[model samples]
Target: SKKFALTAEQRASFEKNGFIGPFDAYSPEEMKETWKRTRLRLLDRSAAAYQDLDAISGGTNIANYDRHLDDDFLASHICRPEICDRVESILGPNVLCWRTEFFPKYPGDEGTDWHQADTFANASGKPQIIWPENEEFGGTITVWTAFTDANIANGCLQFIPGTQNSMNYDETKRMTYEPDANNSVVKDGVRRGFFGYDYRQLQIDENWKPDEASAVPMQMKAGQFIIFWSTLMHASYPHSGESQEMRMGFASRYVPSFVHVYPDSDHIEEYGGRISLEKYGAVQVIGDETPEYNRLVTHTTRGKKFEAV
Candidate 1:
């Protein structure tokens, strides 16, 4: 039943669980070669959106934001009907690409902390993606693609099903950032998660904790991807084993064409670095944009056009 469209049952499943898909994409041979070349292209990111910074130091991967705007590969990849059609199934017919980021885990990198993002104020203190006036959920649909292979031992993502319907963490309360390159210290015997921003600080109930027993690990190969809500309670496994081959997941975040991209902000401040959104604009991936809610960018700031895939 892979008609590239979600059925009513599938839509209900996503509504209840806040996610679906660890499904297919490119073939192993194709992805392996494409990702290899893509990785190399990323190295020469003098045209990167946030290249204004001196160095993306101290383990903050904030500089990895929105390469889809400039890279022909990512631009085409984002508009791929496999991802877009599925996203439209949940987010409605009109959809746009607002944000994308890269997640990297070296041989010994710490897993991301258990967290949920609504308005995405958890880190930046700004409402990065704002939902419509009457909508119940204030989060975006995130399509996280595994650029490299991912496994439980290699820092694959983990999520708690049915946990996305409720809010366990509050983004308004700030989480202090303490960069740990070696991840030496432990908080309350907590071994790892969330690069540097301690996500525990945003807990709605100080004594409450996430339901780890219900957590499901999502393992994907290169060219595979998963769809989820930004509001889902999710985390990842620490790269417990030493694998020289790392895991890289590209998170392309999407929202309906009507939603505001950056509701009330010109710049984003987090990951120990503050960057401007001067070059930021949502790309209409699936349908028509209303244009009043937010400005749309047909091409990259560097004049690179994003043709539909």
Candidate 2:
């Protein structure tokens, strides 16, 4: 199709499947070298958006809030045409990347809790991003880029096709943060746990359960990435430790420029930690910024200046 965008058929498929693609972004060699350099830059987060937040230091949720605001490579990575074009196909040209985080699965780590996020109140008891009340839309699109080979034994991602439109978990409900159960709780005969809080706590019906049998694993190589609505019923497999390498997933959350990122929240607290929103701002990836509705930043203090893709 024109502009490397999604086809109508593909759009319909994405609507039905709740997701699509392990599309190529970087070659194996390119991804390897990119990761090798980015890994070190990530460690030195002195200029990071929320460096002062223990939420990042706690080794749990709110990890690496937005390195793109501070790293050159990541700034470019987020604006890559292969990604922006397809995203624009669905979200429209006026889009902003609101949040990015690192999802790393080490050997023996618990699988992510099966859940869907609308308003993202599944943890902090606050709607991080809010759409207009009259609009039919809710939830952001998540572009998950794999920085390492991810497989079943190494904690690949899983999705329950066509489950994006329903609300199974209530984000407004409070999820008690308990780190003791991390990588230790076994649900459905499988070792699985949330980053810290149990997602089951937010279910609309306490007795209701996820359909694991309907879930499909999405295995990807080092350079690939996939796109899906964050509202989709998704989870990951436990890293079985068959391989020593960790499964690393970089998730960049996107939304239409008209959406309100963080809404009235000045800070986001979860997993027993909190971070102020002083340094946070969304990046306009396509079209023009609807700045009156959201905060926009052109350059990360530590990185190259930004130019929309």
Candidate 3:
């Protein structure tokens, strides 16, 4: 019930469509300058939670998994009222931000594959998030914010409305990680793949295909954000190299307090890199009702405290 809370109609639409917004977090000019400074700060990740080891040196997604636990700006970004208020509106008062990722698409990079994640075991081969057994749904709400302008030319996100309820991909099915082989293939005339693995490998039906005709291209300006379910059928367009600037998207994954994150897991093995969960913990972004089952990070690795807005 604060500023940026979704309205009744907006919530209803989000319930039905599985997504909403392109709402402002900061002005384009502000975001642009912020990114410039933040980008440099990220390079010096002396206090980063996940240490870059030999296993991750050969191109690893875990390299930049959770900077919010170390960086001041990112720590604040995750708790900003503009994002937390809206997320709390959907997830209720007790909310926890379990993860954050940087999705960068450089010039001429292939678009991401069409995919939906429920258990988030698609790549990791183990469930990353699990809701209570009594709960009917499984998946986190992802608030994706564009740190740079996202457009057709630079790979904006695309989604198939109302497709969040059912998952087309099976998380239990594992896909072989072959970055070179998978990245070279173009499906439906589009150069797309799920990082290195092919998302189609987990298809529930071998003959089934995503309905691209109904896909909606979500173009957002710098500093604008959009919210969607992790189970939603979503993908992005390939960077056409029309512009020199690379597109960067910051995704913060949120779930209610009851949900379990990284259950029985002390390490993450995915994207050909193995990482130990030594310094990772979920941030309580909304109310003070975190259960005893989950780990909470009250402060950053750099000794900065996490104070939710």
Candidate 4:
């Protein structure tokens, strides 16, 4: 196996579990320093793709989306061989990174709801990425990297193994946004919510529920990362408030170059923020094949070209 490629054994296990290693991308010191430097750069959003949503977001989490399209560190982070090689091993030689989002859990913030995203319409009411008909998978492959230490007390991620095949939640179902009421509601003694909307509203059957008993918490250090299907039943723990440190997870979504990203949509309406996609373009991270069905961008809005490993 190559330095970053998944071994055959690892790939086999990923196929069964619908997830892979919390592999090392940086050393603890390296990650900390990198985060410190990048933190300041992120504050300058002049070149950000969605500039008109500040009034709606009011400095909300949605504003943190797609910073890689402008920032140098994140632009390079998305194409790191540690992430790209493994992703290419599964998604074929040709792949594109369509979206990146920052998942931050501040002290006392609610845990993310137990949910799966197929078509990613759980809140948007429209499919974000569409795989061609007859394709085996309908969702993207997500590589979530920790920018801070993630533990149960600091809101680490949780996953229910092998639950990636079936659709427990219907994306076509409309989820009402009620941040005031929804964010305060707790499920089974755990403070969980899907951003501002209730994910249970999108369940295919009202009576059917997730098997949380089998779910496993993925505790990671600041430098580690894990890969999983976006369709996998996944959620995160609530920040227990035992610590003031916030846990940050950077999620980069990947798919075959042939897949359609944003799929006829010019704007995204989700998480109580509506933003135009005027400058959004998927990055070809691993292959020589062009993104025939999707719009591809070689450089960031700030005029920095992306590195495709």
TM-scores for every candidate against the unseen true structure: 0.92, 0.94, 0.95, 0.94
Error of 4 at 168 (Å): 0.3
Model 2 misplaced regions, further than 4 Å: 55-60, 122-124, 271-273, 307-309
> Ten consecutive residues with minimal summed lDDT in candidate 4?
53-62
lDDT string for model 3 (1-309, tens) is 698899999999999999989789889999999999999999987888877566663345676589999988888889889998899889998999999999999988889899998887723578888898886988999999999999999999999999999989898887766747534578888889876778899999989999988999999999999999999999999998899889999999999988988888887766566688889999998999988989999888987777643
Collision count of model 1? 4
Q: Say which candidate scores most in TM-score.
A: 3
Q: Where is model 3 more than 4 Å wrong at Cα? A: 57-59, 122-124, 181-184, 271-273
The list of candidate 4 runs beyond 4 A from truth reads 55-61, 122-124, 181-183, 271-274
What are the per-residue Cα lDDT tens digits for candidate 4 across 49-103?
A: 8887745742245687899899888888999999999998899888999999999
User: How close to the true structure is residue 154 of candidate 2, measured as C-alpha lDDT?
Assistant: 92
The model with the greater lDDT, 3 or 4, is 3
- Candidate 1, residues 129-221, lDDT tens digits: the string is 777668676788899998888899889999999877789888888766675546544544445756666788889999998887788999988
What is the clash tally of candidate 3?
0
Worst 10 residues of 2 by lDDT: 54-63
* lDDT against the true structure, each candidate: 0.80, 0.84, 0.88, 0.86
Local error of candidate 1 at 166, Å? 1.2
* CA lDDT, candidate 3, residue 268: 79
Each prediction's total of clashing residue pairs, residues at least 3 apart in sequence or on different chains, is 4, 0, 0, 0
